[PDB]
């Protein structure tokens, strides 16, 4: 019953475009239609980690070959201060056949003692050893920490704390102090010099709370619009040639259709946003843990549209709320059952799991079975495997990898 004319397909395709893509398409269509239109600083030089390293290199008594090797080494240093390439790549980049790996090793060791100490380290173990080598021998637990870092670091990252006792032949009193001394170091020596700027996004729709009720409105700073060029439209009448009149009429028709399509897209987006805000009202008042498990079919029934239209509209569009900026698809989620009769959204379950894990006993972290048992007191009835999946999504290590020395 729906006739797919090549322009209805163009109107439908306009729904799923973000603001930037829509602006680019509007510009592209604007440069082809004459009747469409749209309604000293220099800066400062900032010093980064590599600039500091090269400044220290230039003031170090290196030879020409050593200076070239140092330049190659400093080139392959990331923001965190770690060497991103093997020394074989540096040797190849030197391009001279008279230099062995030993000279590169010596130059790298000289560079690793620059400021900050531990920069240009091969890995975490090397950085920790470099940092520990600068401590005076009077440190109470220098030797135990050095042994643990040098020999047994994988089982320290596995939070064993029992096999470590057997291999190192220590006790809890000394092992805890050694672990604290290890944790007192700097995992990222290269972050002392920080450079950059956070990146922001421009929301498409703004929701506020006025006069006790939530108001949703399109963001006027980014809403796209076009306009009819009246100068060329005044020439639509006869201009001593029929072809000019036909051209003007066709271009005016296309421009008017495009303006209508843009207005319809904006209206549809506004209505969908209003429906979404009305459906999820507890979230904007009390944050997460109160999300409702709504789907596309829930929104598609309150606006008398189809599920495909709702799916297309909610793609890559952002909503700004007193809580933050969201993707307008973050409000759609799956659900689990409820003992009292109902549904619980997966976002609320993830928030509850995060809150429960964040307030557990460090000596005995909760397992997935314990989390399931705790959740089965509020009437959620979520499976252990689902809890494990949620925890993995939250990027939280398992129970045996969260215990401390207490």
């Amino acid at each position: 019953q729906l006739a797919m004319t090549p322009q209805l397909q163009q109107a439908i395709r306009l729904l799923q475009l973000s603001t930037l893509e829509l602006q680019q398409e509007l510009q592209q269509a604007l440069e082809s239609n004459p009747l469409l239109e749209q309604i000293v600083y220099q800066g400062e030089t900032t010093q980064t980690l590599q600039d500091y390293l090269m400044w220290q290199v230039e003031l170090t008594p290196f030879s020409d070959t050593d200076r070239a090797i140092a330049t190659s080494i400093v080139d392959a240093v990331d923001e965190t201060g770690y060497l991103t390439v093997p020394l074989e790549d540096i040797l190849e980049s030197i391009g001279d056949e008279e230099i062995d790996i030993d000279e590169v090793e010596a130059v790298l060791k000289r560079i690793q003692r620059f400021d900050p100490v531990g920069v240009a380290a091969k890995d975490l173990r090397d950085c920790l050893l470099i940092q520990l080598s600068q401590f005076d021998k009077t440190t109470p637990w220098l030797e135990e920490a050095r042994l643990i870092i040098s020999d047994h670091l994988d089982l320290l990252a596995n939070h064993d704390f029992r096999t470590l006792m057997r291999v190192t032949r220590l006790k809890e009193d000394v092992l805890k102090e050694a672990v604290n001394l290890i944790q007192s170091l700097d995992p990222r020596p290269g972050q002392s010099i920080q450079t950059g700027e956070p990146e922001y996004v421009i929301p498409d729709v703004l929701v506020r709370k006025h006069n006790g009720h939530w108001t949703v409105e399109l963001n006027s700073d980014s809403i796209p619009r076009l306009q009819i060029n009246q100068h060329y439209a005044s020439m639509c009448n006869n201009a001593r040639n029929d072809g000019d009149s036909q051209f003007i009429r066709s271009n005016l028709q296309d421009a008017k259709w495009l303006i209508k399509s843009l207005e319809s897209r904006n209206d549809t987006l506004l209505r969908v946003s209003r429906c979404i805000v009305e459906q999820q009202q507890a979230f904007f008042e009390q944050g997460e843990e109160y999300m409702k498990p709504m789907v596309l079919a829930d929104i598609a029934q309150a606006v008398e549209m189809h599920e495909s239209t709702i799916s297309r509209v909610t793609t890559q569009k952002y909503l700004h709320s007193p809580r933050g900026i969201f993707e307008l698809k973050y409000f759609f989620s799956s659900h689990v059952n409820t003992e009292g009769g109902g549904e619980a959204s997966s976002t609320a379950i993830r928030a509850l799991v995060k809150k429960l894990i964040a307030a557990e006993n460090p000596a005995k972290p909760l397992s997935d079975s314990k989390l399931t048992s705790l959740l089965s007191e509020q009437g959620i009835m979520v499976a252990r495997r689902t809890v494990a999946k949620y925890r993995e999504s939250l990027s939280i290590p398992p129970s045996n990898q969260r215990k401390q020395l207490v």
């Binding site: 975490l124 939070h159 995992p187 990222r188 709370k209 007193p322």
Partner: protein, 149 residues
């Protein structure tokens, strides 16, 4: 101004061409001591990788540098500060959803809080000193207030 006992005479060239000679008692009595007040501002905004947080947990800095901050990450009233001291502690989130084995090792050894977080705290500019006499907090409506507010 102030009433000063003054004599009109040359004194060894120390009043040559509009120069003024001042006794030490004027300095000792603090007759020309003045009070100057300066204001500093720290703004926490909303980014794409989550919002910026004003907090006391700056992972890279040491324990001493956070000694003059309260539980909310704000300097105490009456603290003596100098150049480089932290006034308000703020962290800017950095977000990546992929964990390399090196990043997993770092998270396991030093905790996940140190990762995916930057430092953007407010600090006293070099050559500036004084005493913290007033702190004011402005919060957007709908945002939870901290203890200081």
């Amino acid at each position: 101004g102030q009433n000063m006992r003054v004599a009109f005479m040359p004194w060894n060239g120390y009043n040559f061409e509009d120069s003024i000679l001042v006794s030490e008692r004027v300095v000792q009595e603090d007759r020309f001591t003045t009070i100057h007040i300066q204001e500093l501002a720290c703004v926490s905004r909303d980014t794409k990788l989550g919002p910026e947080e004003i907090t006391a947990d700056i992972p890279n800095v040491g324990e001493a540098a956070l000694s003059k901050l309260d539980e909310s990450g704000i300097v105490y009233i009456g603290a003596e500060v100098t150049g480089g001291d932290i006034l308000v502690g703020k962290v800017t989130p950095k977000g990546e959803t992929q964990l390399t084995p090196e990043e997993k090792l770092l998270r396991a050894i030093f905790g996940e809080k140190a990762s995916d977080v930057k430092d953007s705290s407010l600090r006293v500019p070099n050559g500036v000193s004084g005493t913290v006499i007033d702190v004011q907090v402005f919060t957007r409506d709908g945002v939870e207030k901290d203890k200081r507010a």
